[PDB]
C-alpha cells in the first residue's frame, strides 16, 4: 500500500551495426542503380610496321535494382483498466514497439532470409570465409583459435580496398585478452590485471548478438569444450561500400477506428525500410 | 532498332504442356506469368501454383513442392474455397490471345505451375511462361 | 628446416633480417618489394613460448 515509482526492467538491446553500413535514403519504394561488371581489355601490344589495329573486347555495365520491405504489427487494450491504472500503458506499449523494431531490423539486416526481408550478409554467403586450422593435444585434434590467427586475419585484408573495421561478440574479446603463453604471462596487457585498449584505435567495433562461438562463455576448449568447428567468430569489411541500408519512412502509430468494438481500443503501427549487399568482395569472414 | 531485352527481364518456360519446371526467382524481385494456348479449349482449366525451398543437400537445387497460400486484397469474395492460390483460364480463349497474371506475394526461391485435377487433358493445349524483372544481384 | 622425419622447406623471420642487412653497403639506398601476404607472414610469427 506504498507503491513506489521504481520501474526495474532489466532487459537489454544489442549494439547497433547500423552506423557502419552505407546509408541511403529513398522516397518511393523502388530504387535502381548501375554497376560496372568489368572494364575489359582494350588494345594489345601490337607489332610495328602494321597498318592495322585490334578492336579488343568491350566491357560491361549491369543495371540492378532493389525493393523496400515493410514492417507492421498490432496491439490493443481493454479501455477499462486503462482509465484506472497506476501507470500509462500506451507510453509503455509504444516504447515497446521501436524496441521490437530496432532489434528486429538490426538482426534481419544481418541474417535476413530472402523473401520479404532484406538478405543479410550472413545468409548471403558471398563474403569469402576463412576457416582456421585445428591444433593437437595429447594426440587429439581439437579445433582451436589462437591469437596468431587473429593478427593473420585482420592483416590479410587487401590494402587497396581501404580501411576496414571488425565486428565480433565481446566473449571473443574476453577470450583474446585472457590468453596465456607457455610460462604463464599474458599475451596482451602484461601485468595490469586487465587488457582494454581503445577499440576505436584498433578499429574493432563490438556487438552482442553475433553468433558468439564461445557458447555462453563456456567453450574455451581443451576436452569436450572444443569450439565445435564451423562456427562464426568475427567479420571484417569496408562497410561503407560492402553493405547498404535504405530508409523510407520512420515508424508511425495510427488509431484503428473500426475493429475497436467499444471494448478493445486497437492501435496499429508500421514502418518501411530495407537493405541489400553491394559488392561483396570488400569483406571477409573468420571461421573455426 | 530493337534491344537485347533478354537480359533485363529474361524469361523461362514454366509449363510446356507435358511437364512442369521450377524457375528460380531469387536473383530477381518481381515476376509474372504469360498464359498462351495453342488450340481451342473445351472447359475452364485450373492450374495450381507451387513454391519451392532450397534443398538441404544443395542450396541451389529446389526441394519439395509446397503450395503457396492465397492472399485477398479487399474485393475478393470467392476465396477459392481452399485458401490456396490458383489460376483459372476461362473458356472461350481463342488461340491468338495471351493472358497475364501473378501472385501478389512470393515466398521462397522458386515457383512452379501444374494443372489441377480434372483439367489435366486440356492443359496439354496451353503454354505458361514466367518473365521476371530487375536483378537484385 | 627439419620437422618430425621429413625436411619441409620454410621461411623464418631470422632468414629475413639476415637478407635485408646483407646488401653491399656501397651501392646506395636500396628498398625492397614484396606481396602483402608475405608481409602478413612475418607479423604473425611465434617464438618458442607464445610471443609474437
Amino acid at each position: 500500500p506504498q507503491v513506489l515509482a521504481l520501474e526495474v526492467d532489466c532487459n537489454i538491446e544489442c549494439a547497433s551495426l547500423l552506423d557502419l553500413y552505407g546509408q541511403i535514403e529513398v522516397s518511393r519504394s523502388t530504387f535502381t542503380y548501375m554497376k560496372i561488371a568489368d572494364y575489359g581489355q582494350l588494345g594489345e601490344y601490337t607489332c610495328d610496321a602494321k597498318c592495322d589495329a585490334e578492336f579488343g573486347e568491350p566491357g560491361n555495365i549491369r543495371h540492378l535494382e532493389g525493393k523496400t520491405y515493410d514492417y507492421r504489427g498490432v496491439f490493443c487494450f481493454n479501455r477499462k483498466n486503462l482509465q484506472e491504472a497506476n501507470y500509462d500503458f500506451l507510453s509503455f506499449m509504444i516504447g515497446a514497439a521501436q524496441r521490437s523494431h530496432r532489434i528486429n531490423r538490426n538482426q534481419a539486416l544481418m541474417i535476413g532470409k530472402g523473401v520479404n526481408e532484406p538478405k543479410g550478409w550472413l545468409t548471403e554467403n558471398c563474403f569469402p570465409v576463412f576457416q582456421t586450422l585445428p591444433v593437437d593435444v595429447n594426440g587429439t585434434s581439437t579445433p582451436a583459435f589462437l591469437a596468431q590467427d587473429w593478427r593473420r586475419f585482420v592483416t590479410s585484408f587487401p590494402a587497396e580496398y581501404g580501411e576496414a573495421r571488425s565486428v565480433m561478440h565481446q566473449n571473443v574479446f574476453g577470450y583474446l585478452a585472457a590468453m596465456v603463453d607457455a610460462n604463464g604471462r599474458f599475451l596482451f596487457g602484461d601485468g595490469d590485471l586487465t587488457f582494454t585498449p581503445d577499440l576505436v584505435r584498433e578499429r574493432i567495433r563490438i556487438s552482442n548478438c553475433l553468433p558468439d562461438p564461445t557458447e555462453g562463455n563456456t567453450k574455451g576448449g581443451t576436452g569436450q569444450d572444443a569450439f565445435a568447428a564451423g562456427s562464426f567468430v568475427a567479420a571484417q569489411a569496408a562497410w561503407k561500400t560492402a553493405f547498404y541500408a535504405v530508409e523510407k519512412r520512420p515508424m508511425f502509430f495510427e488509431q484503428y477506428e473500426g475493429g475497436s468494438s467499444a471494448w478493445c481500443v486497437k492501435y496499429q503501427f508500421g514502418a518501411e525500410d530495407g537493405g541489400f549487399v553491394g559488392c561483396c568482395e570488400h569483406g571477409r569472414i573468420l571461421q573455426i | 532498332m530493337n534491344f537485347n531485352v533478354g537480359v533485363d527481364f529474361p524469361s523461362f518456360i514454366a509449363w510446356d504442356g507435358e511437364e512442369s519446371f521450377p524457375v528460380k526467382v531469387d536473383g530477381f524481385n518481381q515476376f509474372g506469368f504469360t498464359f498462351k494456348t495453342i488450340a481451342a479449349l473445351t472447359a475452364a482449366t485450373t492450374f495450381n501454383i507451387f513454391y519451392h525451398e532450397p534443398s538441404d543437400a544443395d542450396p541451389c537445387v529446389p526441394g519439395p513442392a509446397i503450395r503457396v497460400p492465397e492472399v485477398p486484397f479487399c474485393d475478393t469474395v470467392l476465396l477459392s474455397e481452399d485458401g490456396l492460390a490458383a489460376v483459372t483460364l476461362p473458356e472461350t480463349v481463342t488461340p491468338d490471345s495471351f493472358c497475364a497474371g501473378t501472385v501478389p506475394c512470393m515466398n521462397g526461391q522458386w515457383i512452379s505451375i501444374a494443372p489441377a485435377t480434372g483439367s489435366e487433358t486440356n492443359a496439354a493445349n496451353v503454354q505458361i511462361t514466367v518473365t521476371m524483372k530487375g536483378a537484385t544481384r | 628446416v627439419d620437422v618430425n622425419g621429413t625436411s619441409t622447406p620454410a621461411f623464418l623471420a631470422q632468414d629475413w633480417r639476415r637478407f635485408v642487412t646483407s646488401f653491399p653497403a656501397e651501392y646506395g639506398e636500396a628498398r625492397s618489394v614484396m606481396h602483402q601476404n608475405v608481409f602478413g607472414y612475418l607479423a604473425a610469427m611465434v617464438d618458442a613460448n607464445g610471443r609474437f
Partner: peptide, 28 residues
C-alpha cells in the same frame, strides 16, 4: 549478328584455410 551476354544464377561459397607460420623450430 547476335551477341550473347550470359551470367550465373546460383553462387558458390568460398572456403579457404588460414594456415599460419609454424612453431619456431631450431635448425640443429
Amino acid at each position: 549478328m547476335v551477341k550473347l551476354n550470359c551470367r550465373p544464377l546460383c553462387q558458390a561459397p568460398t572456403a579457404s584455410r588460414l594456415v599460419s607460420p609454424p612453431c619456431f623450430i631450431c635448425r640443429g
